[PDB]
């Protein structure tokens, strides 16, 4: 429970940093749709969760490098929050 | 087996709630395609499974917040049903 809350804080820091760095990298490329923070934060969630909606994605080199940072840090930190909430529900099954 | 069936019931409750809340949030946004329950239920499955077909997705703030609820609750509950059915097949291997 104490470690699960830490992984949540790590995930939020990746999302805010990944959203800010994506806008900073994509602005300047003709045709980039990842140019505002409110939806770049939504893109960082799509990346961390790998939900695959395919509506926003980076088109630049650094914007894709920022995505790789959000991929490695996001999928890992989200997998921890997923596994932590999975063990919590497992304990609720034995309690019944 | 008793806990696996509970995770299935939890997953179905997330899908129905996530489908109903998505339609309620997306209706009112010019251009929203997630406006009917039969396909919003199909969208909630795409979100919980992260299959990534990219044909339906929310465009509003709350509709994306509802998606985050479906992401956290769906991916976790679906990962339990996946791991449970994975251990069942593992037991069938030792039995041969």
């Amino acid at each position, epitope marked *: 429970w104490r470690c699960a809350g830490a992984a949540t804080v790590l995930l939020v820091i990746v999302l805010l940093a990944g959203s*800010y760095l994506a*806008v*900073l990298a*994509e*602005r*300047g*490329a*003709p*045709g*980039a*749709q990842l*140019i*505002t*923070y*409110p939806r770049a934060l939504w893109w960082s969630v799509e990346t961390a969760t790998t939900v695959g909606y395919g509506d926003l994605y980076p088109v630049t080199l650094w914007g894709r490098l920022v995505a790789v940072v959000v991929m490695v840090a996001g999928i890992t930190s989200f997998g921890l929050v997923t596994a932590a909430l999975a063990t919590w529900f497992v304990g609720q099954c034995q309690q019944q | 087996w008793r806990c696996a069936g509970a995770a299935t019931v939890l997953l179905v409750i997330v899908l129905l709630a996530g489908s109903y809340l998505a339609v309620l949030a997306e209706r009112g*946004a*010019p*251009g929203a395609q997630l406006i009917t329950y039969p396909r919003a239920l199909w969208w909630s499955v795409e979100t919980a499974t992260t299959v990534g077909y990219g044909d339906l997705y929310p*465009v509003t703030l709350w509709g994306r917040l509802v998606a985050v609820v479906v992401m956290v609750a769906g991916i976790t509950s679906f990962g339990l049903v996946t791991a449970a059915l994975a251990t069942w097949f593992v037991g069938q291997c030792q039995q041969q």
Partner: antibody
Amino acid sequence: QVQLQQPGAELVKPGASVKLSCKASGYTFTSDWIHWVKQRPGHGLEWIGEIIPSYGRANYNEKIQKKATLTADKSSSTAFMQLSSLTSEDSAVYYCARERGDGYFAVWGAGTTVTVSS
Amino acid sequence: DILLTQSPAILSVSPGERVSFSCRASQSIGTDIHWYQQRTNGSPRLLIKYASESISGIPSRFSGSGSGTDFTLSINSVESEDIANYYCQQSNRWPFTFGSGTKLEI
């Protein structure tokens, strides 16, 4: 109060340079971008470039002639634009606008009436 | 480069009736359009943000609509202080582009 302050006018000779200022005031965040819009007399608004002062990175209009240099100083909260090698085609009112990173230009300046003549 | 074509360029209106400013985009940009007002010897004033969301202080006579490629700024019952030039601007793709503008005649 006036959130974005700009000088009244700037007279320059054909072929010279000038540094337009845009003094800011009020709330300032790290997600704030400063833009610049050119409006020639009798014409519409024309985007010139954007800059985020908290980082120092600036982008410019690639479809027109790149005759500006966007800089920023975080201490005075004032953004600058270096219009160099100006001609008759550069006599316009240059507005600066603040963007909260969400896309729109919520607050504008007063515009600097730059005239290029001998 | 999004091409925001505003048509018509001059709108001749009778007082008290409803008017509509059209702003077509070169491609589908969702609802990432914004409306600005600039009067004579003035600065552009933001009217509508994100197609329909209103701005604090702007009179509610200004109403926005449209999604995809076609967008509409509507003034329910016009008045004298509305005589200005109106510009639409997109933020869906970089760079941000403006429209040709439309003048309001009464």
